Amino acid sequence: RQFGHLTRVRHVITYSLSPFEQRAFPHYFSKGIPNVLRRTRACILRVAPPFVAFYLVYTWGTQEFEKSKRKNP
Amino acid sequence: ATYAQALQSVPETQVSQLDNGLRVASEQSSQPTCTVGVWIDAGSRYESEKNNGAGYFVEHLAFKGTKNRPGNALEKEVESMGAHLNAYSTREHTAYYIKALSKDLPKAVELLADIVQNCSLEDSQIEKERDVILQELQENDTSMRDVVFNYLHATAFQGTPLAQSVEGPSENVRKLSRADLTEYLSRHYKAPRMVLAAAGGLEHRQLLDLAQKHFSGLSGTYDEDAVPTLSPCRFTGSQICHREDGLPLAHVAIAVEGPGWAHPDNVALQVANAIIGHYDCTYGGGAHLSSPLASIAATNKLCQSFQTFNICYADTGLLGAHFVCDHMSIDDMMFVLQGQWMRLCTSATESEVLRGKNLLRNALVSHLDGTTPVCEDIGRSLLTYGRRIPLAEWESRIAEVDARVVREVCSKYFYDQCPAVAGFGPIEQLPDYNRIRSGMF
Numbered sequence: 001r002q003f004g005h006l007t008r009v010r011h012v013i014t015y016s017l018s019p020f021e022q023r024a025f026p027h028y029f030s031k032g033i034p035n036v037l038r039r040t041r042a043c044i045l046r047v048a049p050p051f052v053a054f055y056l057v058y059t060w061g062t063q064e065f066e067k068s069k070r071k072n073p
Numbered sequence: 074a075t076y077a078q079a080l081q082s083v084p085e086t087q088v089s090q091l092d093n094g095l096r097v098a099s100e101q102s103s104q105p106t107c108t109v110g111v112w113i114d115a116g117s118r119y120e121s122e123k124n125n126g127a128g129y130f131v132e133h134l135a136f137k138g139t140k141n142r143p144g145n146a147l148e149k150e151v152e153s154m155g156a157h158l159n160a161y162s163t164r165e166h167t168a169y170y171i172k173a174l175s176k177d178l179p180k181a182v183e184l185l186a187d188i189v190q191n192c193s194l195e196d197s198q199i200e201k202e203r204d205v206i207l208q209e210l211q212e213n214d215t216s217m218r219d220v221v222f223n224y225l226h227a228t229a230f231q232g233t234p235l236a237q238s239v240e241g242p243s244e245n246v247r248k249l250s251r252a253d254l255t256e257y258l259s260r261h262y263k264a265p266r267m268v269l270a271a272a273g274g275l276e277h278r279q280l281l282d283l284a285q286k287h288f289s290g291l292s293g294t295y296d297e298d299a300v301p302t303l304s305p306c307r308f309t310g311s312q313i314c315h316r317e318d319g320l321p322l323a324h325v326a327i328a329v330e331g332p333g334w335a336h337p338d339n340v341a342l343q344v345a346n347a348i349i350g351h352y353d354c355t356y357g358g359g360a361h362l363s364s365p366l367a368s369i370a371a372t373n374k375l376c377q378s379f380q381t382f383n384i385c386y387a388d389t390g391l392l393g394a395h396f397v398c399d400h401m402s403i404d405d406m407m408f409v410l411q412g413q414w415m416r417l418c419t420s421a422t423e424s425e426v427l428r429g430k431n432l433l434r435n436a437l438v439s440h441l442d443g444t445t446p447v448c449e450d451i452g453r454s455l456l457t458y459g460r461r462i463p464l465a466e467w468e469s470r471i472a473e474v475d476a477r478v479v480r481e482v483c484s485k486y487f488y489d490q491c492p493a494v495a496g497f498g499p500i501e502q503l504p505d506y507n508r509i510r511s512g513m514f
């Protein structure tokens with residue numbers, strides 16, 4: 001795979017600035033945090049539930065194990 | 074005679090100035106023909122986003138009739154005496170000139186005076202030229218070279234008047250009004266902003282009297298609040314890539330910021346550019362060309378053509394090169410080109426610099442061949458340097474250049490500097506800007 005033989009592209013214009021003309025951390029916080037919150041809210045419903053389940057099974061199972069070895073659960 | 078004595082035999086250019094500020098300059102020869110014209114400090118750099126394209130629109134109207142010679146009357150008069158009337162606009166200068174028999178100099182000066190001061194600008198003519206300009210915009214779109222150079226200016230001078238094209242955006246062409254034009258004219262076409270130049274078989278005294286006679290009415294005041302001055306234009310290291318795989322060859326233009334017209338460094342830079350040179354598939358030298366870039370390109374078939382350039386503006390400029398090549402040859406071309414700029418910055422040899430100096434000497438003299446090239450040199454020089462630089466001075470400046478001067482001057486403008494890059498066509502292989510930037514050191 002080599003530049004020049006990848007694929008066909010027509011009518012696209014790309015504008016760029018030298019890295020020396022710009023900031024490396026533009027709006028790092030004033031925008032970074034808000035986007036992180038967006039991305040977090042955006043996935044938490046897909047990611048978190050299964051782990052909350054793990055957490056529950058773990059605490060229940062661990063406590064169940066403890067109680068089971070005692071005289072008076 | 075030696076090249077040295079020949080240099081000291083060129084008639085000195087004579088310069089005078091009228092009360093209204095108009096400068097009159099001429100170089101007399103014994104040619105039975107001549108070229109006389111008006112050079113003006115007006116161009117798109119002086120335009121704002123609202124009237125960008127105004128100057129070019131005026132160029133379209135300039136020869137369409139004057140109050141004294143309506144319609145095609147001006148045209149008939151020029152043609153009947155066998156003269157030629159031409160014009161051109163750039164981002165900083167505008168010129169209107171006539172080639173005619175030396176004996177017709179009086180009528181030539183009258184016609185120019187008439188053109189520059191009494192242009193009709195008939196509403197119906199303005200509407201016709203509107204369509205002509207739109208069609209010219211479409212034609213220019215088919216010239217990949219013109220497109221890439223307009224793109225280079227757009228990105229290199231982004232956010233400044235120099236980023237603007239001479240022709241202006243199509244919407245400005247559709248909306249510019251006579252009011253806009255007359256306004257542009259009253260503001261820029263003033264005597265202090267013009268130079269009446271002439272070269273050929275004529276005497277300065279005759280030209281001066283003709284100028285007094287025909288240009289005295291030209292305003293030389295304007296005022297104070299309306300004196301269009303130029304602000305420096307910021308250069309930006311950047312890239313603009315218009316990918317169009319439908320085009321057969323890619324065009325690439327790359328440049329670092331140049332010093333501007335007035336700087337002494339331009340001579341050494343011209344020497345360096347002469348070393349790298351130019352090339353195209355029809356050159357007979359091929360593998361034996363002296364320029365490493367030229368011979369590598371020719372033997373390895375790396376491009377159809379390439380050309381170094383030093384485009385100068387008042388206080389800035391574009392120093393670099395343009396090449397046309399196959400979609401699979403862009404990286405190689407950029408690699409060899411940048412390698413050559415670096416070789417000059419760190420290792421220019423006395424012998425190659427001497428070659429560069431000789432190329433420049435030949436280009437300078439062979440360019441001033443004929444009354445038109447000479448007249449243009451007079452007009453432009455007076456606007457840019459404020460004086461005609463004699464060949465003997467150019468030689469002295471060229472003579473001062475050696476390998477040390479070339480390494481130092483090239484290092485100053487090329488070494489570890491951010492370039493402006495413009496690409497158009499099948500450019501998937503045009504190197505990423507970071508890679509191009511790293512190539513600068």
Ligand SMILES: CCCCCCO[C@@H]1O[C@H](CO)[C@@H](O)[C@H](O)[C@H]1O
Nearest residue numbers: 337462463465466467469470471473
């Ligand atoms: C790099 C050298 C900068 C100064 C070069 C000046 O050069 C001198 O200019 C005079 C006026 O144009 C000429 O009359 C004279 O013959 C020339 O040698």
